[PDB]
């Protein structure tokens, strides 16, 4: 299937070269898979979700996304126009307040919730968790991420926007999950993107158009943008039966576009998420 004039990020992950504008993907589109977006929540009523999105858990007074960050990421995962896996089921877990803030204990609680909750859902093709958040290193946060991944959920996390080594950040520094770096439309590492040996892969993260609250849309940047591209791609590949939750990150790295990125520090992988679609 093909989406013409698609956001540059979608086009990029379905091409071996930059500069294209069509997003090629298999019609299955992640149907049968589920993706938990652990963020500020999701405006589930947004037309772009077609009813495929719903809040399942909040750690605050409301389950409503009063920020927009979570709705933006969820849209990149599976909104009809801005998403990678256009048919996947989205579940929102509000672990961040409407200012985009959250305490480590709440974030950890959110991760354990998903590990257990996935057992109450019907996701025959597999479960993914997208975590576009992070802070300073913490062995407890890293550990919570490792548990979620271990329970059978494909965990994708943002590398961070400090233009530094992601070793000092969590859950970015947990080796067992999928740490996502950010790239721009000209195949350059995003200027704010963290790097380092712990990164597993890069995804489009600069000037990403997606859904926003109030039923709108807007373009923003960050490794938080990149992470849902990979979470969505994983759900897409799992639905296709190409990989499983335990090996998705590795499969994505093996089949990525190699050496296409510039301004990648020595010691950091030069790999860009790619769906390898062939019609």
């Amino acid at each position: 299937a093909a989406q013409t004039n698609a956001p540059w990020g979608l086009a990029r992950i379905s091409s071996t070269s930059p500069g294209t504008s069509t997003y090629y993907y298999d019609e299955s589109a992640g149907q049968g898979s589920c993706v938990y977006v652990i963020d500020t929540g999701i405006e589930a009523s947004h037309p772009e979700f077609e009813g495929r999105a719903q809040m399942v858990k909040t750690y605050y007074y409301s389950s409503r996304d009063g920020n927009g960050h979570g709705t933006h990421c969820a849209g990149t995962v599976g909104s009809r126009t801005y998403g990678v896996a256009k048919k996947t089921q989205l579940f929102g877990v509000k672990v961040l307040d409407d200012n985009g803030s959250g305490q480590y204990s709440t974030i950890i609680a959110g991760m354990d919730f998903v590990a257990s909750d996935k057992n109450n859902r019907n996701c025959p093709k597999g479960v993914v968790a997208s975590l576009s958040l992070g802070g300073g290193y913490s062995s407890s946060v890293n550990s919570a991420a490792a548990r979620l991944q271990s329970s059978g959920v494909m965990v994708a996390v943002a590398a961070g926007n400090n233009n530094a080594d992601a070793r000092n950040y969590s859950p970015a520094s947990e080796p067992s999950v999928c740490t996502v770096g950010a790239s721009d439309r000209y195949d350059r590492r995003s200027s704010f993107s963290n790097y380092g040996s712990v990164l597993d892969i890069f995804g489009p993260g600069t000037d990403i158009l997606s859904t926003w609250i109030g039923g709108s849309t807007r373009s923003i940047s960050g490794t938080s943008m990149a992470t849902p591209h990979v979470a969505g791609l994983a759900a897409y590949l799992m639905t296709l039966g190409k990989t499983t939750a335990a090996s998705a990150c590795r499969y994505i790295a093996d089949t990525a576009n190699k050496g296409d990125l510039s301004n990648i520090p020595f010691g950091t992988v030069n790999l860009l998420a790619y769906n390898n679609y062939q019609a």
């Binding site: 576009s132 300073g136 926007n161 704010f192 938080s224």
Partner: peptide, 10 residues
């Protein structure tokens, strides 16, 4: 948190 979402970028 400890990351982002603030809305005037860098």
């Amino acid at each position: 948190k400890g990351e982002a979402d603030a809305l005037s970028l860098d």
